[PDB]
Amino acid sequence: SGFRKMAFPSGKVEGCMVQVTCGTTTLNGLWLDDTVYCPRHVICTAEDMLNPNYEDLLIRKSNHSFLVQAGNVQLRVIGHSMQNCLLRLKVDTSNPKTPKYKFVRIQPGQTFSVLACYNGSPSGVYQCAMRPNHTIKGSFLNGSAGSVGFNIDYDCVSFCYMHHMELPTGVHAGTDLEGKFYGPFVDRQTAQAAGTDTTITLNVLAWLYAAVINGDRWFLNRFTTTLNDFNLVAMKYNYEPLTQDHVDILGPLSAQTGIAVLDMCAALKELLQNGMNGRTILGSTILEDEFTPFDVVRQCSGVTFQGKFK
Amino acid sequence: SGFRKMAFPSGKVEGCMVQVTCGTTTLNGLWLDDTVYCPRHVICTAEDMLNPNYEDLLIRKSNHSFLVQAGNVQLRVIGHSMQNCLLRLKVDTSNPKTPKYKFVRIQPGQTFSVLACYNGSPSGVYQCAMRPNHTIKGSFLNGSAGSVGFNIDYDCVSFCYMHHMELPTGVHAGTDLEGKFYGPFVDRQTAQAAGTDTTITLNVLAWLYAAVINGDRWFLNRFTTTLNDFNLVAMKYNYEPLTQDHVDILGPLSAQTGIAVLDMCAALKELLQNGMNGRTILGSTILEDEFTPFDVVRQCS
């Protein structure tokens, strides 16, 4: 029992974090096999960020302009290139601690764990989701660029995110591990902004099921609605349109709670336009949307009674 | 910017988790040096986990009765003994991944990271606070016993918790790494229930300071209070009494924001007697009490 935002154990990722210095700029790098991946703006001074010319800026660099520290072993960069918005640094030493890994591009609404690093030293870990506007709501200070996001499946770490920068609203932007940003963002000093941040309706619903299993059922006192009637209300509070596929995904949770989906949307309808009236749902006053259906079932598994109900 | 419950990186603990099977019962253990620490009810069966006699139960068992696995590597048990509610198994090898470590007994109000494991395989990491009624609001399934709570001070793992029992209300109970339970609980299926919890006043104030650091200033007002006037308001709202040591611990956040601690207590006192009235604090209408002053600092620089 219990329901908590849970991150993946970070050990396999820690063994890959290194510090990367160029000139007077430092940030973090990802050391896999003989390659160190890091955000390309490590080759920049603060004044360069306004209109950097990365190719020209990098042409000026030699292998020995790049300084890579792994714990204390100094690696030797023996090659370098730019791939989209990342540098790939070839090092002499192949990381003995490399895990099985994939480079994947995560989709909005899915979750991942973040290993926040400073000076190449892991400092903390937490769970977040790729937002529909292609930002994430992280916790990053200066020097955190190069920290990575990841999901672990069996013994394989699948890396989805590398951190680059902060938007004025305090949310964060970065790239996949090929160097391609999520969203419209670019690694130069310019006015950029997160779009209309919508709310991952599928996750809110998944979360509402988690509340029922953990004893919260007060909000369930409405009669079934329809998808069109639910979608209509969900328009102005910026909730993504509910779809049949989303309903199918929640089928296991409806079956375990005995609470049909369109019955749970009846409750969500009420919650959105009239609020919570000062109560709480799983200790929260806000509708949580960074738990996927997968996430909620992993923590809320159950038992199937095999009489035949209605 | 940004502010979230974040746990410590768990790799140093992941390298110490092992699997301990004693009959048909499996839970996790902690392998430091040549010793595997694990909850002693691994030796019970369901019939035993009623009212067991451990020293009795233990006498029948011998070394070969303990299957201990670090991954696929089976370890051979070279001895065994009970220390309070833990077993200590002596084994062939000093764990090569034994980090610098120490055992600590945490106090109510403090937080730690939990590495939830199953069959000796780590599966999740999240942040917890020791409640004043000495329980934990964790997330634990069957076979999570032996999972550990820890903090990390640079390269030293401080182990403060090992998981044993789930209580009726769904909150959790366990021991320090010497096997003494936090709180009055026992590793017996007997009637026992968490006492009435209270709110961790020091951590609510830390959280209001984190709010200020992250923009929210509306609740700041203009009065002050002594400790006494504050505590008389707080007692009413089920809050822990605030001591002068608590005030001192809040110095750095007070200095870094410019709000005197007893000024922040006047702000809090008002929020309890008046409510928030449609306004939010870090987006919430409820007062969070599971961040310590240290957790806020570590994250707000």
From Swiss-Prot, chain A:
Site (described: Cleavage)? Q306, G307
Which loops or segments lie on the Cytoplasmic side of the membrane, by the record? 1-310
Residue intervals of the Peptidase C30 domain = 1-306
**What reaction is this protein's catalytic activity?**
TSAVLQ-|-SGFRK-NH2 and SGVTFQ-|-GKFKK the two peptides corresponding to the two self-cleavage sites of the SARS 3C-like proteinase are the two most reactive peptide substrates. The enzyme exhibits a strong preference for substrates containing Gln at P1 position and Leu at P2 position
Q: Where in the cell is it found?
A: Host cytoplasm; Host Golgi apparatus
Catalytic residues, per the record, are: H41 (for 3cl-pro activity), A145 (for 3cl-pro activity)
> From which domain of life does this come?
Viruses
- Assembly and interaction partners: Monomer. Homodimer. Only the homodimer shows catalytic activity.
Q: What does this protein do?
A: Cleaves the C-terminus of replicase polyprotein at 11 sites. Recognizes substrates containing the core sequence [ILMVF]-Q-|-[SGACN]. May cleave human NLRP1 in lung epithelial cells, thereby activating the NLRP1 inflammasome pathway. Also able to bind an ADP-ribose-1''-phosphate (ADRP). May cleave host ATP6V1G1 thereby modifying host vacuoles intracellular pH.
Report what the protein is called. 3C-like proteinase nsp5
State the organism of origin: Severe acute respiratory syndrome coronavirus
Gene, per the UniProt record = rep
